[PDB]
Symmetry: D2
Subunit: 268 residues, 4 copies
């Protein structure tokens, strides 16, 4: 009798046990959803990590920059869920920006080849995934992507902020296409989460200046948030994604839900 | 095993069977919530209307302009739910603007005494209700109010648009105070709903010009909405309010959720 | 050969030599404008203060809460500028909120009579002034009001923030009416300025807590602003108001121009 | 005694007599500015077109995708304005999106190679130009770029809307870097202008459906604008760019000024 009882949902973006997608997958399974998982490059690691989920789920390879992977995706998902069955939900939890684009060097020194790779994976792929999966989605379905509020500039995040501004625009166009299938498209703008990569940045992987800036930036959320913010807890973010995958927000599309403790609503 | 199983929720704003609050109350009861209702002026009518809800609920008198009604509210609610029990949710579904403020005459011709009455009932009362009820709310609780997107000016809505801009500001301050109690505060910005008063305006109760403008304004929503908009169906709005009252959006506060078919995200 | 050569402009809001309106008036006169000034309550003080402006200007009494003052305003201005002449510009630099509404006590403890007085003077009066003066304004004319960004909640500003949210909504409706006369209506959202009242608040006139919060709040602007922010210098704000009064922003109306050093565009 | 008397300004983006940059260049020269022009690919055509400007100006070749052109730009500008002299202003009026990205085919059918080329020219190049020219800019200087409001999705504009969302984000980061030189960075969001390319689209160059959608979209501006909108008149847009290049908006940076007749402030 869970929130997502009987729903078939595809979850992308698991790489480690600290991935936001790992927590989305765990909460969705606790709420009765039947999952299909997609992974990039390190498939042996991803299978070993996902063995720790409450229930066993099939794992499919998906590199969003690979045209062949995207062209065969719908057929591979149909084989995993069985003929005559369709998806009720899709979770995009994919992001990447080369070090040159995220504070290892000044904003002006990031080459366009690096920025373009980052925009392909972080923004264009949201449209790529919707194109591939909408023909195998049921009416009343839901597509959810992960965002980080880019309305104002900030230190070190640099070109990844630009990629998120592009993603928010892409989401509004995806909602127009998804609407024809009776499917909603929305993003969850989360507060900062201490994943393995974020902890490494704070530890100085992109230089001391960038590390100090990210640490101070992350600390501002708990101070501003009227209900506080715990960067070591991904469960409130996972619950918000599940709310959008459910039948309980049926009139919301092309939109952004903020799971940030209310920090974006307060100046100080 | 409903979305709101075991929750004690106060619902204000029922006047007829077409009130948005009537639909919020019905959905909340179908989802296992135990309600307390508040009504203004026509208590015999409200009792007769609420006899049609799935379950019987106690009805309390509340005029938000009456200081005595607000001062005794917490004690009257405690008597209705029993000593030692507290509320888990509060629904503000209250609004009013005199005819002079809503298109019966030009924008510049509305006297301040009329505008002030409208702002008292539609915006200040959101803070009044939170002040009265937060001392009897449990941690993890939720306060929800009804909004109509006022970010851009529009024909005929006139000073009620100004009252909604004030309400959105009030909501951000209420979230600061509610946070100290472990309580969230949010608004649902709904698309237009054909209540008795809205149908009367379309029928020309505020003059032909205002009626023609409101009819054309309301018709724009379904055209712009990627998933469409049915002004004769309040159920998607009621479901969204219940989503905010639940434990499934635990990191959202001082915010606005749009239940408008995605119309605010599209230009044409 | 100044920016405003030959223009007839009404400037409201002068009380002391630290008033934002005093600096707007000085810059407008240096740029060739012919002024008419309006003052409230302390007319002997205002005449003595305005004797320090580069040129002598007629001073008229205007209490925005007084219906008689507003009804006679157009006739009194016509007498001052001469029959057959009209205004090219209007500056609204009026604001007030009782101490109960600005941090001397908690947000929930401000009585509605006090909040209503504050909203009348700070927001409704923008519509009152436009109603009185549009019949004596030339096509190509400009109305400008003073704003303080209220999109996010902040400590101590409390109900004055709510009044500014209402003012921004009022400005969008005033633009609809002013457009029929070929007149623009806009607001300037300024960064914090150390006027006599603001210095007194920092000095603890509204209590130590409010003073400490306002001081820290004000200090954040210079840190966030890419070009910095000097709270002791009103000249950049006065120049921005003159830009809107000129013929150089002819396609901007119902809008907000930010003269805050770019602080609102940066998170940290 | 013009608005820009004695200022040295670089203007990019002239291709025909209908280019927005042609009108910016003409108004800047009428206001006393000394110009340097940059052109792409068709240099013989651009020289012939710019012979019609009020004053003769040097023309330099600049393809924003060419690393060599950008590396030599500052030296070539210094040679044109003379040693010991620096620029006071820079105008970015550059945009491009392949037909696949602007309605000749569905949104999902635009290949990433085409979208990436469009984002390089329309958004990344704003950062490229600032990097090349800031070392030869005077304190008090100004950088201005051209925008088209992308906050909401719209028919046919498709991936060019996504490119504008990226440009707005880039502008906020450019303001951080430019601030170190005492230079402002802002965008002008203009209403639709009937350039040669826009007239060809309305005439069906990108298919009948796209043409019909663009014509209806463009027609909405004049209806919504409180002061109206003339798509055949670029002079109000050129005046707004000159206002930002002047000393009259000295506290505005990382921002957007809307020269759209106030259309973005009104729903209907
Ligand atoms: N961590 C935070 O503070 C935070 C906050 C808000 C939003 N987000 C967003 O949440 C999402 C998930 O990030 P995360 O923080 O969990 O980090 P993560 O490293 O755990 O997840 C990112 C995922 O992207 C995948 N990926 C990269 N390139 C790919 C490609 N070519 N094809 C397919 N998959 C590819 C990686 O394999 C990985 O699984 C991202 O969109 C991120 O921007 C993160
Ligand atoms: N109908 C729409 O199109 C629409 C759309 C979005 C939001 N809303 C908002 O939803 C809310 C509910 O409105 P509705 O459309 O259901 O209409 P409604 O007439 O059914 O409800 C408004 C309620 O306000 C109550 N009220 C008025 N003055 C009061 C006072 N002094 N004290 C206490 N209660 C008082 C009335 O008794 C009534 O129950 C309002 O805030 C309205 O602005 C309506
Ligand atoms: N000082 C700041 O930090 C700051 C920043 C942004 C915006 N503002 C705004 O600028 C405007 C001017 O304020 P200021 O800071 O120069 O302070 P101020 O005290 O010098 O000016 C406010 C003016 O309002 C007038 N006023 C009050 N009640 C009135 C009434 N009933 N009728 C007519 N006039 C009345 C006062 O006489 C005074 O001249 C206000 O709208 C204020 O909110 C101030
Ligand atoms: N026309 C409108 O309705 C409208 C409205 C708002 C904003 N804009 C924006 O105004 C700007 C100017 O466009 P326009 O409408 O005057 O059209 P336009 O065709 O006259 O100008 C665009 C310019 O971009 C140049 N360009 C293209 N690729 C280039 C490259 N690789 N290197 C250098 N220059 C390159 C072209 O040569 C041309 O001069 C664009 O950013 C456009 O998006 C246009
Ligand atoms: O989006 C975020 N974090 C949000 C944030 C911003 C500021 C402060 N705290 C948190 N992280 C993603 C994670 C995936 N990516 C990545 N991972 C590995 C290598 C390269 N890139 C891109 C960045
Ligand atoms: O907020 C709305 N409607 C939203 C809307 C706007 C534009 C087009 N369609 C819908 N209605 C409320 C209802 C309660 N009020 C009221 N009721 C009775 C008498 C006076 N006022 C105030 C107005
Ligand atoms: O709007 C402002 N200041 C903006 C601000 C906000 C936060 C930090 N720094 C600056 N001041 C006005 C001034 C006129 N008013 C007033 N004056 C006298 C007595 C009562 N009220 C109302 C408030
Ligand atoms: O940005 C605009 N127009 C704004 C607009 C949007 C919707 C309705 N009316 C106007 N035009 C530019 C012009 C330069 N570009 C271009 N030119 C030639 C070939 C390819 N691309 C890119 C598009």
């Amino acid at each position: 009798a869970g929130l997502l009882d009987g729903k078939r949902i595809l979850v992308s973006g698991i790489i480690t046990d600290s991935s936001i997608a790992f927590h989305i997958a765990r909460v969705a399974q606790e709420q009765g959803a039947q999952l299909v998982l997609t992974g990039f490059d390190r498939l042996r690691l991803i299978q070993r990590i996902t063995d720790r989920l409450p229930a066993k789920a099939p794992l499919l390879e998906l590199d969003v920059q690979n045209e062949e992977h995207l062209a065969s995706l719908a057929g591979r998902v149909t084989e995993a869920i069985g003929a005559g069955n369709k998806l009720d939900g899709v979770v995009h939890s994919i992001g990447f920006m080369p070090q040159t684009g995220m504070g290892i060097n000044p904003f002006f020194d990031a080459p366009y080849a690096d920025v373009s790779k980052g925009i392909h994976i972080s923004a264009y792929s949201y449209a790529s995934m919707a194109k591939a999966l909408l023909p195998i989605m049921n009416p009343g379905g839901s597509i959810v992507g992960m965002d980080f509020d880019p309305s104002r500039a900030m230190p070190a995040y640099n070109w990844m902020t630009v990629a998120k501004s592009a993603l928010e625009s892409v989401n509004r166009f995806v909602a127009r296409e998804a609407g024809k299938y009776g499917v909603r498209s929305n993003l969850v703008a989360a507060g900062p989460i201490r994943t393995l990569a974020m902890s490494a940045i704070v530890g100085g992987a992109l230089g001391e200046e960038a590390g100090a800036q990210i640490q101070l930036l992350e600390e501002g959320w708990d101070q501003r948030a009227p209900i506080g913010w715990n960067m070591k807890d991904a469960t409130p973010v996972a619950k918000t994604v599940c709310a959008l995958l459910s039948d309980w927000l049926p009139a919301t599309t092309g939109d952004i839900i903020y799971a940030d403790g209310g920090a974006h609503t307060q100046l100080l």
